Structure 1
Amino acid sequence: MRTYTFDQVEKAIEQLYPDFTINTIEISGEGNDCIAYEINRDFIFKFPKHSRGSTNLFNEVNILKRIHNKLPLPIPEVVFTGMPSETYQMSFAGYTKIKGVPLTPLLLNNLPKQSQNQAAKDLARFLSELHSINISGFKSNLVLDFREKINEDNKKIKKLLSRELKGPQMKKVDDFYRDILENEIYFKYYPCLIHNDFSSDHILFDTEKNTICGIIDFGDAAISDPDNDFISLMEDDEEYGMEFVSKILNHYKHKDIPTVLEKYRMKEKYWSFEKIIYGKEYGYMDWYEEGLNEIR
């Protein structure tokens, strides 16, 4: 976590875009990587909160450039870019603002049923088109192999928690990982481009038309398991629930729905472990203690 004032934001952008006069600045929203500023009412400028976030911002800028006209929904179009330094791979990025509000579970459920169903179809067509984008020209570094990630997570957890857990407790963590890794269904998928953070906060809605009008926040985008993009929608608390996602799956012509459900169940048990690792790697200490407490 690092912080910006309006004066730094304006100065940073002026250095590189001297001819863009700034009138108004205000915070649009915040994710885990960047703060997003609304400039001149019509632009969103993301500035990274730390080096990791900046690397994700850099990722987002390059992916958006590659897929800019391949999708059936608006996505952010980059119009302004910052520069690298010893600290940030990209100091900021500016794009055209997508008007609209997040499609919260609450909003979605209050829509007429025909609109709920168009939303499901629209989300599926967007995912289908996305997961079909040809990935040849993509940076091979973008590939996230789930088997590799799980193995590396198991060594990170050991190394992080070795002096925190009693032996029997670490042995059970070890068992959990071993069990995950002997199940081939988590690891057999055809890699493609995925949004990888495809949740309701990132789906923008036009409440005059009652239709989805944008997908945002491509900072986690990767070449990986397409099923990631359904499981992130399935949580009942903060997301859409099984019923709605099962309409999406059906429009998508998903062939193996029980496999999607099993990946969701495993991801849900996996969350404590993600909180420890994501906690340390994004320096969110609250998450770390929560997952550690849970593990006991």
Structure 2
Amino acid sequence: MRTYTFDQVEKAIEQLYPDFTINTIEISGEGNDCIAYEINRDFIFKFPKHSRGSTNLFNEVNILKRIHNKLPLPIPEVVFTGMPSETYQMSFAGFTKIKGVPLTPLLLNNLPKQSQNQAAKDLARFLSELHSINISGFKSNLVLDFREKINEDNKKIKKLLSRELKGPQMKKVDDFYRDILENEIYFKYYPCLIHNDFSSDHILFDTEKNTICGIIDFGDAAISDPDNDFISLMEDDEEYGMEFVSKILNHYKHKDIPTVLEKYRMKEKYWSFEKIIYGKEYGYMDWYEEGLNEIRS
């Protein structure tokens, strides 16, 4: 955590944008990586909470400029950029505001069936197009290879938990990693650009028309397994549940649905380990103790 006042936000912005005059500023959201501010009701400026989140913002800015007119839904559009320092790769970025509310599982399920299904269709089309974007211009650094990531998590957990876990417990952790890594189904996919945080909170909805009017938060995007972007929608109360995602899958013409379920299941078990790592790497320490406690069971 770094934290900001309105005067700091304004001065950072005035420095690089001296002719953009500012009336209203108020906090609009706050994520793991950035705080968001609404300026003149027409712009959302993200300011990083730490270096990690700044690097996330920098990556978001860059992917958006590559895909800005390639999708069938609106996406955030970058209008203002800050600067790199020794602490942040980018001090802030200002985006066009997208009107709408999050498409919560509550909101979704109270829609008439016809809108519900059109939502599934519109999401499938957004994903099918996103996953078909040609990635060849893209920086090779965006490639998230899932085998390497898992091998790397195993060593980070070992390094982190070696003094915290009893020998037999750490053996069982090594067992779970070995087991995941021997199953080829997690690691044979054709990589493509994926949103990689595709969930109900990043899907915006227009309640006058009852249709999806935007997709937001591209800070996690990578070139990786297209199946990541369904599994993040599958969790029953938290997200949409299986019946809805299966409609999305059918529109997307997915060919190996039992593969997605399998990755979903493993992902959900994998959450405890993500809570430990992601706790420390995002220095949020109640996740850490929680994951560790789940692991000791």
Counterparts of residues 87-166 of structure 1 (less than 5 Å): 87-166=87-166
What do the CA deviations read for 1:187-233 (whole angstroms, capped 9, x no partner)?
00000000000000000000000000000000000000000000000
Task: Compute the displacement of 1:30 (Å).
Answer: 1.2
What do the CA deviations read for 1:145-180 (whole angstroms, capped 9, x no partner)?
000000000000000000000000000000000000
Whole-Å Cα distance in 1 between the matches of residues 260 and 31 of structure 2? 27
Whole-Å Cα distance in 2 between the matches of residues 31 and 141 of structure 1? 24
- Structure 2 residue 158 is matched with structure 1 residue 175: no
Task: Compute the displacement of 1:100 (Å).
Answer: 0.1
Whole-Å Cα distance in 1 between the matches of residues 35 and 204 of structure 2? 18
What do the CA deviations read for 1:29-51 (whole angstroms, capped 9, x no partner)?
11111111000000000000000
Task: Compute the displacement of 1:2 (Å).
Answer: 1.1
Whole-Å Cα distance in 1 between the matches of residues 164 and 227 of structure 2? 34
SS at match of 1:244: helix
Whole-Å Cα distance in 2 between the matches of residues 27 and 116 of structure 1? 31
What do the CA deviations read for 1:226-263 (whole angstroms, capped 9, x no partner)?
00000000001210000000000000000000000000
SS at match of 1:55: helix
Q: TM-score under structure 2 normalisation?
A: 0.99
Whole-Å Cα distance in 2 between the matches of residues 104 and 260 of structure 1? 22
Which structure 2 segments of 5+ residues have no match? none
SS at match of 2:149: helix
Whole-Å Cα distance in 1 between the matches of residues 54 and 106 of structure 2? 32
Whole-Å Cα distance in 2 between the matches of residues 13 and 191 of structure 1? 37
Whole-Å Cα distance in 2 between the matches of residues 21 and 12 of structure 1? 13
- Structure 2 residue 273 is matched with structure 1 residue 281: no
Q: TM-score under structure 1 normalisation?
A: 1.00
SS at match of 1:233: coil
Whole-Å Cα distance in 1 between the matches of residues 236 and 33 of structure 2? 25
Whole-Å Cα distance in 1 between the matches of residues 238 and 13 of structure 2? 35
Task: Compute the displacement of 1:27 (Å).
Answer: 1.0
SS at match of 1:95: strand
SS at match of 2:94: strand
Task: Compute the displacement of 1:61 (Å).
Answer: 0.2
What do the CA deviations read for 1:252-285 (whole angstroms, capped 9, x no partner)?
0000000000000000000000000000000010
Number of aligned residue pairs = 296
SS at match of 1:223: strand
Whole-Å Cα distance in 2 between the matches of residues 66 and 204 of structure 1? 21
SS at match of 2:76: coil
SS at match of 1:263: helix
